[PDB]
Amino acid sequence: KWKTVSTIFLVVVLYLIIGATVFKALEQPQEISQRTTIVIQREKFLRAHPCVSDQELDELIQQIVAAINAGSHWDLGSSFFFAGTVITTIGFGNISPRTEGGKIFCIIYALLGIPLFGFLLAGVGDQLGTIFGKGIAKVEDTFIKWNVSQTKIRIISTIIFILFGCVLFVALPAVIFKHIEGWSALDAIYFVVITLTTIGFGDYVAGGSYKPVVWFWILVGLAYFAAVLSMIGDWLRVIAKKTKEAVGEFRAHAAEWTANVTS
């Protein structure tokens, strides 16, 4: 009977409206600086070469925008990586199928590969969850009868989870993907979160300016954030009830307050 979904719907709508104003307050500034200087390279290029004219630079952009549709890809291994992005729903989509048969196959290949891969990820999650269960069984005997109480013991372990998990999964896999002479510090964490949350794989680089072991870290990392996101959902559930009781309690005191004023 009681819906309770529309209230969550409004929070999500409100959460998006906040996120909207924040992203445009962080990205629209740099959007101007780029796109004002892009005019500068176009204004400089026609001056640097009277050989090429206005009518001809548009033709080049057209022929480069036409090349966006294509970009050797689809080789023995690239189509393997593509199929991995499909069943993991990461789907970076820089190289997407252009053939009618390739799209029809991709529809069926996804409708069957996504559930199939789900059983793998679920089994890897349980398999890795017990590995973590053994790792805490030794930690939950050598530190428990000490002074840290029942409600606090649970928190030290969750810190050891986040630190030992995230430090592994932001340092090694992002680099094990492209492993030496590492990277910018932030774009490794940004790469990992965007990838393992199945959001879309932050910008493959080929250095213009391993197969079982790499998909190991991916499969373990996807299972890692699968639990990480699920815990965050649990902490949101707690904070939901803690804020549910606070309002109904404040609305309870403000109600009898108003009755006292009517005297």
Ligand X SMILES: CCCCCCCCCCCCCCCC
Footprint (CB under 6 A) of ligand OCT, residues 96-125: none
Query: Site for ligand X (CB under 6 A): which residue of 247, 254, 259, 261?
Result: 247
Please indicate if the annotation marks 135 as binding a ligand. no
Q: What is the CA radius of gyration of the chain?
A: 26
Footprint (CB under 6 A) of ligand CCCCCCCCCC, residues 222-261: none
How far from 213 is each of 21, 46, 81, 210, CA to CA, in Å? 41, 49, 13, 5
Query: Site for ligand X (CB under 6 A): which residue of 163, 244, 250, 252?
Result: 244
Out of ligand B7G, ligand CCCCCCCCCC, ligand CCCCCCCCCCCC, none, what residue 112 binds, judged by CB under 5 to 8 A for its kind, is ligand CCCCCCCCCCCC
The continuous run of DSSP H or E covering 71 comes out as: none
Query: Site for ligand OCT (CB under 6 A): which residue of 11, 20, 61, 232?
Result: 11
Please indicate if the annotation marks 90 as binding a ligand. yes
* Residue 20 in contact with ligand X, rule: CB under 6 A: no
The one-letter code for the residue type at 118 is G
Number of other CB atoms surrounding residue 144 within 10 Å: 11
Of the pair 117, 177, the CB lying nearest K ion is at 117
DSSP 108: H
> What's the full length of the chain, in residues?
263
Query: Site for a second copy (CB under 8 A): which residue of 137, 156, 162, 229?
Result: 229
Footprint (CB under 6 A) of ligand B7G, residues 171-210: 176, 179-182
* Residue 232 in contact with ligand OCT, rule: CB under 6 A: no
Q: What is the contact mask toward a second copy in residues 182 to 221, using x (rule: CB under 8 A)?
A: ----xx-xx--xx--xxxx-xx----xx------------
Nearest distance in Å: CB 184, ligand CCCCCCCCCC: 13
Residue 34 burial (10 A CB sphere; 0-12, 13-18, 19+): exposed
How far from 160 is each of 108, 136, 170, 226, CA to CA, in Å? 41, 10, 15, 17
Nearest distance in Å: CB 1, ligand CCCCCCCCCCCC: 17
DSSP 143: S
Q: Which long-range contacts (CB under 8 A, 24 or more apart) does 68-73 make?
A: 69/98, 70/98, 71/95
DSSP 75: S
* Residue 164 in contact with ligand B7G, rule: CB under 6 A: no
Interface stretch with a second copy, choices 26-34, 175-183, 242-250, 254-262 (CB under 8 A):
26-34
CB 213 within 8 A of CB 225: no
Binding residues for K(+): 89-92, 198-201
